[PDB]
């Protein structure tokens, strides 16, 4: 939180107000806490809800943070007994605390190369765009944007997902559709970690003959 430095250098001011965008973004997220009449009525995202609710349990955040200390992608078995896939997508904690807080914690701080400011803007923008999506959809977005999940990330998920070999080829060749049929559920943010659940569709029935009926 508290910025100690009050330097007058122009590059510092840019880092400051860019850092304030980070503090403000996090603060926003913390505040969050024909015959169709014959169809059924079910809550599709009940599965994702239950998961994000399990996250509120203490220690659950740590088991994730523990499992993801060394690597970015890891499988975690939850306290209830279900196995879910977790992944780190961006490491801002390490950049901010290891490269910025010790400098800014001091009276007079100096930044020489301006490229450092730009590199900071590059990493920080993805968080800000994720914050913007959630604030206009009350934490439930669909489809899932490249801000929420780049294709490199999404395809890394599909290959590691516990699905059949046939489904992997299917989902991979039509990723843009799965995005449209997926929900990104904001969950919690505590213990200097932010997490959000992504509900992914899995297609249990494939290649049976379909036919479409047009009437007039």
């Amino acid at each position, epitope marked *: 939180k508290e910025i100690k430095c009050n330097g007058t250098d122009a590059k510092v001011k840019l880092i400051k107000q860019e850092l304030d965008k980070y503090k403000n973004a996090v603060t926003e997220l913390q505040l969050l806490m024909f015959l169709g009449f014959l169809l059924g009525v079910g809550s599709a995202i009940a599965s994702g809800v239950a998961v994000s609710k399990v996250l509120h349990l203490e220690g659950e955040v740590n088991k994730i943070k523990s499992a993801l200390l060394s690597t970015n992608k890891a499988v975690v078995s939850l306290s209830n007994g279900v196995s879910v896939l977790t992944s780190k997508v961006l490491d801002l904690k390490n950049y901010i605390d290891k*490269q910025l807080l010790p400098i800014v914690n001091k009276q007079s701080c100096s930044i020489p190369n301006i490229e450092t400011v730009i590199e900071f803007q590059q990493k920080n923008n993805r968080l800000l765009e994720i914050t913007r999506e959630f604030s206009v959809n009350a934490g439930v977005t669909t489809p899932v944007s490249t801000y929420m999940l780049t294709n490199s990330e999404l395809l890394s998920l599909i290959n590691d997902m516990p699905i059949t070999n046939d489904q992997k080829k299917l989902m991979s060749n039509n990723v843009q559709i799965v995005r449209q049929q997926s929900y990104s559920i904001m969950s919690i943010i505590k213990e200097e970690v932010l997490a959000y659940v992504v509900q992914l569709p899995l297609y249990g029935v494939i290649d049976t003959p379909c036919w479409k009926l047009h009437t007039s």
Partner: antibody
Amino acid sequence: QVQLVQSGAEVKKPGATVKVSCKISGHTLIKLSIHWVRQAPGKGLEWMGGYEGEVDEIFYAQKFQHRLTVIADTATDTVYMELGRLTSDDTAVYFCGTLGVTVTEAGLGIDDYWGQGTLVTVSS
Amino acid sequence: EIVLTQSPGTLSLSPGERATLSCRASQIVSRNHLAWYQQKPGQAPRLLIFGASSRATGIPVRFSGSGSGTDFTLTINGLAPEDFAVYYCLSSDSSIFTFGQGTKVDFKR
């Protein structure tokens, strides 16, 4: 609201030992640096030693390595310095200051906070 | 060990002229770890410049430091009345600080 408070003026005879305090208020000791520097009358400044809260390591100048000691109390936010075998060349004004420079790839940072100075006079 | 020298020892100038103070060390120092301080009589030292060419918070823009390796120069572009004092340059390496003898600034009368 960082403030440095030193002990009162002291007078000690040759061969004795002198303790000077440097109290930190409104700020934590464990994340800042505190160094002791003296000024002989009418001469330049001379470094003696220091403490770096960022790493919790103490540094001494080889000139005084045998007879100077530095103590840091994190619980009282107070730093002391202790010098034995006082001689007439040590009569000077003594300050505690924050010369610690933290260096990362992004830039540099430094504090500039000082006590009021404590005059220590050594004579028989 | 690390030895520092300053030239001149005493500088006498009028307000509004450019003051150039030299600081030379016995060996190469890292630009990040060199610093410049100011002392007036009866005061504790004041930090002016640090990391060679980086000014501290609240110091006027007329003060500027530069240098590398063994030769460093503190430049005051237009002396103000409250600049007349003692100026020490400070070296450091592996948290081992070393002060020069200082260049004093005097009134040209």
